[PDB]
Amino acid sequence: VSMDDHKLSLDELHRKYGTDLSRGLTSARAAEILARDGPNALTPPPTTPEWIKFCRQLFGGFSMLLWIGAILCFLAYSIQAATEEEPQNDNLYLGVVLSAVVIITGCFSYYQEAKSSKIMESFKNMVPQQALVIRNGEKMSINAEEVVVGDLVEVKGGDRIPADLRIISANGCKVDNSSLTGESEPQTRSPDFTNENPLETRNIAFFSTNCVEGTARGIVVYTGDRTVMGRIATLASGLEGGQTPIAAEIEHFIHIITGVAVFLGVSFFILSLILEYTWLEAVIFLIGIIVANVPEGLLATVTVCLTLTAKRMARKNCLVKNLEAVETLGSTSTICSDKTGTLTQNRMTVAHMWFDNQIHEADTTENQSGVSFDKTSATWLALSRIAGLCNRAVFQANQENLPILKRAVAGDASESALLKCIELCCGSVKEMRERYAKIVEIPFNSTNKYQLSIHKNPNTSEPQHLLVMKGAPERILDRCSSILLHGKEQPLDEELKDAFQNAYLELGGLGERVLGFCHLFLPDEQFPEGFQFDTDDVNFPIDNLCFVGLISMIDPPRAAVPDAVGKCRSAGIKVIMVTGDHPITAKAIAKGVGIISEGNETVEDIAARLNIPVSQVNPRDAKACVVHGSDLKDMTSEQLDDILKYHTEIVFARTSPQQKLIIVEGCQRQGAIVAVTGDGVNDSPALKKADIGVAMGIAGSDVSKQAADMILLDDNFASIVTGVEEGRLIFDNLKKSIAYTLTSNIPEITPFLIFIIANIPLPLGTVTILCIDLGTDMVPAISLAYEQAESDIMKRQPRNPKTDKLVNERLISMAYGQIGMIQALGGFFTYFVILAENGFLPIHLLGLRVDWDDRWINDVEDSYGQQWTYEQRKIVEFTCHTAFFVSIVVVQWADLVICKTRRNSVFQQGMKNKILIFGLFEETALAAFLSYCPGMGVALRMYPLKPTWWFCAFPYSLLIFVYDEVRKLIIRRRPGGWVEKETYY
Amino acid sequence: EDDPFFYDEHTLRKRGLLVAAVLFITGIIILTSG
Amino acid sequence: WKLFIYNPTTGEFLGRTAKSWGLILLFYLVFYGFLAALFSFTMWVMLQTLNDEVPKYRDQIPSPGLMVFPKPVTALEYTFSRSDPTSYAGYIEDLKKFLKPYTLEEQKNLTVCPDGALFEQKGPVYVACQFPISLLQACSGMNDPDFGYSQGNPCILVKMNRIIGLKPEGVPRIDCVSKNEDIPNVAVYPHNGMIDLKYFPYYGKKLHVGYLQPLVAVQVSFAPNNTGKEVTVECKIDGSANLKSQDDRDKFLGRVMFKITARA
Ligand SMILES: CCCCCCCC/C=C\CCCCCCCC(=O)OC[C@H](COP(=O)(O)OCC[N+](C)(C)C)OC(=O)CCCCCCC/C=C/CCCCCCCC
Ligand SMILES: CCCCCCCCCCCCCCCCCC(=O)OC[C@H](COP(=O)([O-])OCC[N+](C)(C)C)OC(=O)CCCCCCCCCCCCCCCCC
Ligand SMILES: CCCCCCCCCCCCCCCCCC(=O)OC[C@H](COP(=O)([O-])OCC[N+](C)(C)C)OC(=O)CCCCCCCCCCCCCCCCC
Ligand SMILES: Nc1ncnc2c1ncn2[C@@H]1O[C@H](COP(=O)(O)OP(=O)(O)CP(=O)(O)O)[C@@H](O)[C@H]1O
Ligand SMILES: CC(C)CCC[C@@H](C)[C@H]1CC[C@H]2[C@@H]3CC=C4C[C@@H](O)CC[C@]4(C)[C@H]3CC[C@]12C
Ligand SMILES: CC(C)CCC[C@@H](C)[C@H]1CC[C@H]2[C@@H]3CC=C4C[C@@H](O)CC[C@]4(C)[C@H]3CC[C@]12C
Ligand SMILES: CC(C)CCC[C@@H](C)[C@H]1CC[C@H]2[C@@H]3CC=C4C[C@@H](O)CC[C@]4(C)[C@H]3CC[C@]12C
Ligand SMILES: [Mg+2]
Ligand code: NA
Numbered sequence A: 001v002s003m004d005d006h007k008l009s010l011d012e013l014h015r016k017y018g019t020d021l022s023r024g025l026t027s028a029r030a031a032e033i034l035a036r037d038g039p040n041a042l043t044p045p046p047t048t049p050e051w052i053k054f055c056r057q058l059f060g061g062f063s064m065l066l067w068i069g070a071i072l073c074f075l076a077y078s079i080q081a082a083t084e085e086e087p088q089n090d091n092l093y094l095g096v097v098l099s100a101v102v103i104i105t106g107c108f109s110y111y112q113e114a115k116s117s118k119i120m121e122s123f124k125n126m127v128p129q130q131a132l133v134i135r136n137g138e139k140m141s142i143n144a145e146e147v148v149v150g151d152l153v154e155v156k157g158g159d160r161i162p163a164d165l166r167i168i169s170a171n172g173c174k175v176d177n178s179s180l181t182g183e184s185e186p187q188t189r190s191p192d193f194t195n196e197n198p199l200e201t202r203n204i205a206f207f208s209t210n211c212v213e214g215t216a217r218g219i220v221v222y223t224g225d226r227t228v229m230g231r232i233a234t235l236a237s238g239l240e241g242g243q244t245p246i247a248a249e250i251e252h253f254i255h256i257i258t259g260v261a262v263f264l265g266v267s268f269f270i271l272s273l274i275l276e277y278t279w280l281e282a283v284i285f286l287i288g289i290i291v292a293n294v295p296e297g298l299l300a301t302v303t304v305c306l307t308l309t310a311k312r313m314a315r316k317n318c319l320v321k322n323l324e325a326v327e328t329l330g331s332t333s334t335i336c337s338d339k340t341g342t343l344t345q346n347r348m349t350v351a352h353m354w355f356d357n358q359i360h361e362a363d364t365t366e367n368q369s370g371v372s373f374d375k376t377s378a379t380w381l382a383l384s385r386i387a388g389l390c391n392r393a394v395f396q397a398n399q400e401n402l403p404i405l406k407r408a409v410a411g412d413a414s415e416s417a418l419l420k421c422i423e424l425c426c427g428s429v430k431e432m433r434e435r436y437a438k439i440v441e442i443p444f445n446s447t448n449k450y451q452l453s454i455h456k457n458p459n460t461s462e463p464q465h466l467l468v469m470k471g472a473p474e475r476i477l478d479r480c481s482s483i484l485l486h487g488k489e490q491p492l493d494e495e496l497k498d499a500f501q502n503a504y505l506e507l508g509g510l511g512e513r514v515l516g517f518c519h520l521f522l523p524d525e526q527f528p529e530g531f532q533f534d535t536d537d538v539n540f541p542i543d544n545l546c547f548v549g550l551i552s553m554i555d556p557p558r559a560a561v562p563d564a565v566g567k568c569r570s571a572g573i574k575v576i577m578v579t580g581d582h583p584i585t586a587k588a589i590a591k592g593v594g595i596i597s598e599g600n601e602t603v604e605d606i607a608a609r610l611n612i613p614v615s616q617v618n619p620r621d622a623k624a625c626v627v628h629g630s631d632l633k634d635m636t637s638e639q640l641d642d643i644l645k646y647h648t649e650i651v652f653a654r655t656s657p658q659q660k661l662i663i664v665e666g667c668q669r670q671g672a673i674v675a676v677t678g679d680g681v682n683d684s685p686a687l688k689k690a691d692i693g694v695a696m697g698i699a700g701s702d703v704s705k706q707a708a709d710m711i712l713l714d715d716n717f718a719s720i721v722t723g724v725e726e727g728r729l730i731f732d733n734l735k736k737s738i739a740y741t742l743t744s745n746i747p748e749i750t751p752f753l754i755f756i757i758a759n760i761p762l763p764l765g766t767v768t769i770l771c772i773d774l775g776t777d778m779v780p781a782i783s784l785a786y787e788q789a790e791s792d793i794m795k796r797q798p799r800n801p802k803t804d805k806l807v808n809e810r811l812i813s814m815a816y817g818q819i820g821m822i823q824a825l826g827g828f829f830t831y832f833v834i835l836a837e838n839g840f841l842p843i844h845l846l847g848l849r850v851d852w853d854d855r856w857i858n859d860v861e862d863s864y865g866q867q868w869t870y871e872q873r874k875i876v877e878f879t880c881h882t883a884f885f886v887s888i889v890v891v892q893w894a895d896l897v898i899c900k901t902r903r904n905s906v907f908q909q910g911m912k913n914k915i916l917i918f919g920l921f922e923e924t925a926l927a928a929f930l931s932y933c934p935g936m937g938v939a940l941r942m943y944p945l946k947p948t949w950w951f952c953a954f955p956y957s958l959l960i961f962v963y964d965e966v967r968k969l970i971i972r973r974r975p976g977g978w979v980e981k982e983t984y985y
Numbered sequence B: 001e002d003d004p005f006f007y008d009e010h011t012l013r014k015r016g017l018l019v020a021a022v023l024f025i026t027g028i029i030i031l032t033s034g
Numbered sequence C: 001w002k003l004f005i006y007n008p009t010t011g012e013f014l015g016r017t018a019k020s021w022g023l024i025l026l027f028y029l030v031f032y033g034f035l036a037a038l039f040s041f042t043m044w045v046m047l048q049t050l051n052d053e054v055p056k057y058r059d060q061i062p063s064p065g066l067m068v069f070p071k072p073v074t075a076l077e078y079t080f081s082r083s084d085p086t087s088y089a090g091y092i093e094d095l096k097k098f099l100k101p102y103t104l105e106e107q108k109n110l111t112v113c114p115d116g117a118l119f120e121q122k123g124p125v126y127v128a129c130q131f132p133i134s135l136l137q138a139c140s141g142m143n144d145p146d147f148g149y150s151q152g153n154p155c156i157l158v159k160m161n162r163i164i165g166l167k168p169e170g171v172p173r174i175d176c177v178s179k180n181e182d183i184p185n186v187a188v189y190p191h192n193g194m195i196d197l198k199y200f201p202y203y204g205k206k207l208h209v210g211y212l213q214p215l216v217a218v219q220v221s222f223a224p225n226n227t228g229k230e231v232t233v234e235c236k237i238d239g240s241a242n243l244k245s246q247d248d249r250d251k252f253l254g255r256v257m258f259k260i261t262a263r264a
C-alpha cells in the first residue's frame, strides 16, 4: 500500500484537503471532520479471555504439583477400593482437600491479579497523549484523540508523532524509527521528496515515532487504525519486556526449594519402602512430604503484595508500568535528579536585570505600574527587541481577555517568562514580531546551548539583517567582542568582563536562572537583501556579536522537594544533582533544596575562606563538590569514580544530555542502583540506562514518559519517597513470609527420621503432615503480606543486592536450626506426654517400632504390664499424631507473631494486621474441629485430645517468643555486632 | 463412683466443637471489623 | 560452585574457619545444649506427675484381646511337618521358654486360692495366685517333650491380654471352633474354656509380683487320613458380658483367628 502525498507538491496539497499550509482548517471544519470520521485511537485488541487467565492461575506455580498430588490420592483410593472391600477413605478426603485448596488458592490469586490489573489499566488512562495542532492560524494544545485527517500539528523534540504526517516544513527534524527500521539512529525529516517508496522517503511520519531533535509541521494524512502502524499485526506499543531482579530472586529460590523438596520426598519414599511400607502408603507419603516442603502459598503472597502496592501507588498519583519494579525503587541507593522541572516548580518569572553595568530590579508579578528604570533606554530597547525576536513561544488561542500573568503559553518555561515580561513592560509582542520579519532560526538544543534568529531591520538604519542570539551567558560572551553601553557600543575589556562576573555571582547566588542576549548588525555588503541563509552552512558570522545584558529569572524550588530530599538522605540514599545550568545557580538551588547541607563546603569555598589558591586546598577536605560540564568532557573513567566515592554531596552543572548518561554509568559502576528523574528530551538515554527511571507526568516529554518505568502524575517529589518506602515494604513482607513457611519443614521431616533412627512408634503421619502444611502455612503466610511498614523502614540503609538476598544463609539458619528445631521439640514432647500417660514410658518406646507396627502381634506390653492389641495402640498413635499437629499450631502462633517484625518488637508494631489475627483464629479453629468433630476417627484417623494435652506445647511457644524478642533487643541495642551479623536476615 | 476404662468423650467433643465454633466466629468478626 | 574452600583469603569453607566457623559452631552448640536441657527438664517434670504403679489413663484399653502363642513366622499361620524335627523346633522352644514360670517347681512361692470367686487385693503385699500347669493336659511338658507336635496334634496356647484393674463379670470362657467344616476335632483341655476369676484383677507389673495369667490350650487333632490340609480355628470370649467380643474395627478384641497346616 503505497499511495501518499510524499511525491506531491504543495500546490495540490491544499486543494486535496482544503487546509491552509499556515493557518490550517477552522474549528468548525475540524469538528465536522471529527464527527464524520471519528477519533484518533487504535482499537484495543482483546488479548486473552478472562477464564484463560483463571486456568493460568489454577495450573501455575506449585498448584500443578498439588494437582498431581490430588490425582495420585484419587488413584490410590480407586486402587484400594477395587482391591479390598471397605477400604480406608483417607486418600479420598486427602485428594478432595488438596483439590479444594488448589481451587481456592487459584481463585484468590485470580481475584487479586484482576484487581491489580484493573487498577493499573484504569490509572494508566489518567495520562492522555497531547497533540499540538494548528487551527484558525493560532496554535493550541488539543487531545491526540481529537486529531483528524487534514489538520496540521506542531511536533517538536521529545513529542511523539500523533499520526501519519506529510511534512511540509521542518527545521532540523529527526525522528526515532526503531519500530519499523529497527535502529535508534535518528532519521532526518525534510519536506523534499527523496525516495519513491514511502517507507524510505524522509518527508513522511509513520505514527508512534519519537521526534528526537528539532520541530516540524505537517498535515495528517492517515489517522486511527488506517495508519502504517495500524496495518501491521504487531502492536506499536507492544508489551514491556524484562525480568525484575525480585522476580529473578523468587525464581531462583523456588527452583532451589523445589529441588530440595523433591530430593527429600524421594529419599523418604525409598526409606519407607525399605521399612516395609506398602506401595500406596509410600506414594502418599511421598506426595505429602513433597507438598509439605514446597512453599505453594508464596505466589499468592507476591500477588497480594503487588496488589497492595498498586493500591498505595494509585492514591499517591504514581503511575507504575511494572509493579515488580517498585522493589528496585526500594533498593535504590542513588538518585540522580535534574534541576528544572523536578527539584523546581518550573514556573519561572523575570526577577533581576543587568545591563549598562548596573543591576536593575523588575517586579516578577503584579507590578501594576511603570517599570523602575526608564523604558526609553536604548540598551533596554535592544534587550527587549532581542528577547522578543529570539523567542519561539507564542500565546495560546483566544486568551486576549485575561491578565498576561495568567495567559497560557506553548514554549519552554524560560521563553514563557521572557514573553510575559516583554508583554508586561513593552509593547505588543505579536505586532513587534510582525514588524521584524523572520528569515532563519536555529532551534534551541542542549548541545549548542543557544538560540539564533535572523530578522530584517526596518529602522532608519537598514542593515536588513539582525543577528540576535540568546543562550548561556558565559558561552555567548566568549563569542562577543563588543558591548552596548547606554546605547553606545564599546569593545569588551577585562573591566567589564569581571564586572559581569561579580554581577552574575550576585544574581546566580539567589537561585535564579539567567540568560544572555546579544545582537549584531550584519553589513549590507557582506549579505545583500536577496540572500539565502542555510542552517547547515555558517554563512553569517556566528561569533563577533555585540553583548547587551542579562535577564535573571526567579525559579523557586518545589514545596515538597526539601522534605523529600531530607527523607531520602536520611534513608541512606545519595541524591545527586545533575543539570545543564551554571554551577553557581546549581549550587544555590542545591543548598536551597537540601542537596548541599549547611556547614558542608566545596574546595573553592574553602580556598576563598583561607585566601589560598584552590589548587592548594586538599580535595579531600571538602565533602561537597560542584563538577563543571567542561571538566567532565576530558575526565577519564577512573577519575569519575573518585568524585562519586569520596564526595557525599555531588552537583553536576553544564552537563550535556550524553554526560548525564556518562554520570549514570559511573554511578552504576560502583554497584549502586540509581534512580534518574528526568522529564525533558535530553534525558532519554539516562532514563533507559538507569535501573529505575522516573518521569514527570505533566511537564515531561512523551519520549521521557515512554522511557521511564515510573511516572509522577501529581508532579510530587514526595512520591519518590513513597515509592522507595513501598519497595522496602515489599521486600520486608516477602522476607517475613518466606521465613514463616520454612520453619514448618523441620517439624514435618524430623518425626520420620527419629522413627527410623530410634525405632520409636511414628510421631506424625501423612494426613497430619498435610494438615500442618495446608492449615498453618497458607492463610498465615499470606497474611504476612498485609503487614504494615516498621517504624524504622525509612531509617535503615538501602539493601545491598549482592550481600543481602531474599533468602540467604541467615534466613535458612534461623528458620531451620532454631525455630524449626524448637517446634519439633514441642511436638515430640507432646508425643511423649501422651504415650506416657497411656502406659508407654519414653524408655520403653525405644525399639518398639517392629512390634508396634506388626498387624499380627496383638499383645504389645507397656511399662505397666498391660498388653495391647494392634488397633488399641494404633488409636493412641493416631492421637499422638493429632496432638503433634495441634502442638505445631501452638508453636506457629509464636512464629507468626515473631515474623511480624524484622528488628522492631511486637510491642512497638502493634497487632493492627487484622488478617493475621484472622489466620491465627482460623488455624486454631481448624485444629479444634479436626480433633473434636465426630467421625474424624474414621475419616482421617484423628481423635479428640484431652484438655490438658493442649498446653504441652505452651513452654516452647513462649520460648520462641521470648528468644526472638531478646534477640531483636540485642539487634537494636548493639548494631553491627555478632548477633546482627549472623541472625539478622 | 469413678470407673476406669471409661472417659466422657461426648462431653469432650461437645465442648471442643463449641470452642471451635466460637473461634471461627471470632475470627470472622475480627476479619470484618469496622 | 568453584573453589570456595581455598585456604588463602579470609574466606575458607564458605566463611572464616578460624573465627566465623568457630563462633557459629559454639553458638549452635550452646543453643542446642540449652534446648536439650529444657526438653529433658520438661519431660522430667511430666514424669514426676505420673505413677509407676497404675497408668494415668486406661480408657484406650477397655476390653482385653485374645492372642495365640507361640507367634508363627508369618501372620498366625502354623506350618509344620511331623517328619521334619526342625519345622516345629521353634514352636517347641518358645513354648518351653514361655511355660517355664508355670511349672510346679518354679511357682512354689505362689499361693493357692479358692476357685470361682474374684480375688480382690487391697493389702500392699499383693500375692499372686498360682496356675497349675497340670490343667493343660497333653499341652504341657510333662506329658511329652514336644507339645503335641510330631504326632499330628499341635498345641496352641491362647492367652488373654492383661489389663490393670479389670474385673470380668460372670464366668469368662474361651470357645474355639474349627471353620474347616468341623472335620478335625478341636479340644480345649481346661474344662470347656473356663477362665477362673481368682486370677483377676491384674494389679500391674510393679505391685502384683509373680502374676501368672490364665492360659487356654487347644489341640487341633489332625486325623492320619488327611495330610497337607489347612484348618482355620476361631476363638472368642463368650461367658462374660464385660469382655467385648463383637467388634468389627478390631479383629482381635476378645477374639482370635489362626490357621494350622500339617505336612506329611
Ligand atoms: C530432634 C528432636 C528430637 C526429640 C526427641 C529426642 C529423641 C528421643 C528418643 C529417645 C529418648 C527416650 C527417653 C530418654 C530417657 C529414657 C530414660 C528415662 O526414663 O529418664 C528418666 C529421667 C528422670 O525421670 P524419673 O526417673 O524421675 O521418672 C520416674 C517417674 N516414674 C517413676 C513415675 C515413672 O527423665 C529425664 O531425665 C528426661 C530424659 C530425656 C532425654 C532426652 C534426650 C534427647 C533430647 C534431644 C533434644 C535435642 C535438641 C537439639 C537437637 C539437635 C539435633 C542436631
Ligand atoms: C538415610 C537417608 C538420608 C537421610 C534422610 C534425608 C536427608 C537429606 C536432607 C536433605 C538434603 C538437602 C541438602 C541441601 C543443602 C544446601 C544445597 C542448596 O541448595 O544450597 C543452595 C546454595 C546456592 O546458593 P547461591 O548459588 O544462591 O549462592 C552461591 C554463593 N554466592 C552468593 C557467593 C553466589 O548452595 C550452594 O551452592 C552454596 C551452599 C553449599 C551447598 C552444599 C551444602 C551441603 C550439602 C550436604 C548434602 C547432604 C546430603 C545427604 C544425603 C544422604 C543420602 C544417604
Ligand atoms: C541422618 C541425618 C538427617 C538430617 C536431615 C537434615 C534435613 C535438612 C533439610 C534441608 C535444610 C536446608 C534447606 C536449604 C534451602 C535453601 C534455600 C535457598 O534458596 O538458599 C539460597 C541460599 C543463598 O544464601 P547466600 O547467597 O547468603 O549464601 C552465600 C554464603 N556466604 C554469604 C557465606 C558466601 O543458600 C542457603 O541459605 C544455603 C544454606 C546452607 C544449607 C546447609 C545444609 C547442611 C546439610 C544438612 C543435613 C544434610 C544431611 C547431612 C548428613 C548426611 C549423612 C549421610
Ligand atoms: N530556550 C532557550 N534558548 C536559549 N538558551 C536556553 C534556552 N533554554 C535554556 N537555555 C540555556 O541553555 C542551558 C540549557 O542546558 P540544559 O538543557 O542541559 O539544562 P536545563 O536548562 O534544561 C536545566 P535541567 O537540566 O534541570 O532541565 C541553560 O543553562 C540555559 O541557560
Ligand atoms: C535429628 C536429625 C535426624 C536431623 C537433624 C537435622 C539438623 C542436624 C540439620 C538440618 C538443617 C541443618 C542446618 C541448615 C542450615 C544451617 C546454616 C549453616 O550456616 C550452619 C548450619 C545449619 C544451621 C545447619 C545445621 C544442621 C541442621 C540443623
Ligand atoms: C486462638 C488462640 C490465640 C487461643 C486458643 C486457645 C485454645 C487453642 C485452647 C486453650 C485452652 C483450651 C481448652 C481447655 C479446656 C477445654 C475443655 C474440654 O472439655 C474441651 C477442650 C477445651 C475447650 C480446650 C480446647 C482448646 C483450648 C481452648
Ligand atoms: C521453661 C520454664 C521457664 C517453665 C517450665 C514450665 C513447665 C514446667 C510446665 C509448663 C507446661 C506444663 C505441662 C502442661 C501439660 C502437661 C500435660 C499434663 O497431662 C501433665 C502436666 C504437663 C506435662 C505439664 C508439665 C509441666 C509443664 C511442662
Ligand atoms: Mg530536563
Ligand atoms: Na514449609
Ligand code: NA
Binding pocket: A291, A292, A293, A294, A295, A296, A297, A773, A774, A777
Ligand atoms: Na506449603
Ligand code: NA
Binding pocket: A740, A741, A742, A743, A744, A745, A776, A777, A892, A895
Ligand atoms: Na511455617
